[PDB]
Amino acid sequence: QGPPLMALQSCCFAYIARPLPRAHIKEYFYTSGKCSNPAVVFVTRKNRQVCANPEKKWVREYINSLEM
């Protein structure tokens, strides 16, 4: 329910259990509103993409860090 081509976007169905090394994280993005689950996706220096739970304290702290 939004602009076209949201169907082409990826979604998360699992979240990583423990915090990733803050050192290894480059960027972040939120998955589309089309997705069944809310989710944060971290991308690494090695450009892996890992789904994380936006409700977790470490995830929101990680997000805050990447802004500054």
Binding site: L8, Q9, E27, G33
Partner: protein, 352 residues
């Protein structure tokens, strides 16, 4: 492990198929609606509430069309236009969308009033009121589109740039439902409800006994009061008249009788508005339905990688179908409306 779920095929296929398709849509749609607008302004000249709504409806398709080349590029590459252009175009798209269905509904009601409440429709179907109604309708279409604009942003998603809606994760399923229901109620339920109500009032009036006129002398057979001095009992349908009966004035057979102008014009005006409304449901009801399935995919147990990918294929196909609709209404006028096809012929004669 814990990686996003890929629709890698769906994306790559879409990137090849959609850009030429949308281009074709933008081609046909632009010249089609420009033509419609040119004919309504310069050849039919806007003399009624109907012409006004048809005008606004074509304008609605153009708002939609202006965004199509950008979605076409987005599919072909990524979102290269930056965030403000993302919010703007999303806005135009939903304004086009809602205003589209709102004027189809207003067309339906405008014709309903003309057929069912003819007397009330005298002062109510003033072109003046057509205009103020259109203005209010555009305002409303805009407010209906505001949340979609604010929820939508461009963002870098790893390698690719996107233009997408996001809902605050704290009230995630609330907003998804709100947005989905807003589209489905306004885009599907509401016009279905209007269609149902209005078309029961109209079919009622339409299959009442029809008046016929002699093509030779112009005598009118009024079914209400038949024709007594020639043996025809009042309230007799023209079909229910003995075949050996002739025109009381000139004596031609029933073979030389036609329906009165006001009755055939009414049949034509109902055929037009009906076709528009249901062709709309042909092109857009699939998307709304798939939108409901996606929003409640957990309810149907479709919320896993494999299932949601099939869901996503369906979503993109039906969204795309809906997208092509912004070129369909002029085509409808060309195959259904006698008024358009003739004025189109004069359009080409004026070229010579």
């Amino acid at each position: 492990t814990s990686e996003p779920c890929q629709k890698i095929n769906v994306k790559q296929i879409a990137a090849r198929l959609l850009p030429p398709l949308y281009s074709l849509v933008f081609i046909f749609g632009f010249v089609g609606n420009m033509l419609v607008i040119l004919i309504l302004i310069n050849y039919k000249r806007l003399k009624s509430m109907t012409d006004i709504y048809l005008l606004n409806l074509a304008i609605s398709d153009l708002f939609f069309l202006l965004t199509v080349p950008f979605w076409a590029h987005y599919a072909a590459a990524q979102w290269d236009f930056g965030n403000t252009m993302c919010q703007l175009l999303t806005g135009l798209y939903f304004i086009g969308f809602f205003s589209g269905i709102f004027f189809i509904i207003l067309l339906t009601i405008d014709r309903y009033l003309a057929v069912v409440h003819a007397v009330f429709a005298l002062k109510a179907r003033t072109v003046t009121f057509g205009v103020v109604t259109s203005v209010i309708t555009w305002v409303v279409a805009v407010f209906a589109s505001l949340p979609n604009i604010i929820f939508t942003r461009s963002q870098k998603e790893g390698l690719h740039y996107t233009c997408s809606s996001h809902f605050p994760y704290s009230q995630y399923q609330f907003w998804k439902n709100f947005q989905t229901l807003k589209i489905v109620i306004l885009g599907l339920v509401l016009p279905l409800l209007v269609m149902v109500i209005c078309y029961s009032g109209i079919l009622k009036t339409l299959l009442r006994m029809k008046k016929y006129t002699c093509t030779v002398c112009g005598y009118i057979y009024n079914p209400e009061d038949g024709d007594p001095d020639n043996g025809v009992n009042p309230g007799t349908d023209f079909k229910d008249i003995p075949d050996d009966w002739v025109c009381p004035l000139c004596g031609v057979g029933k073979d030389q009788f036609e329906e009165v102008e006001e009755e055939k014009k009414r049949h034509r005006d109902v055929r037009l508005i009906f076709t528009i409304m249901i062709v709309y449901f042909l092109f857009w009801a699939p998307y709304n339905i798939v939108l409901l399935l996606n929003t409640f995919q957990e309810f149907f147990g479709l919320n896993n990688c494999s299932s949601s990918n099939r869901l996503d294929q369906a979503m993109q196909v039906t969204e795309t179908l809906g997208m092509t609709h912004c070129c369909i209404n002029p085509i409808i006028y060309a195959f259904v409306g006698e008024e358009f096809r003739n004025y189109l012929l004069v359009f080409f004669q004026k070229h010579i």
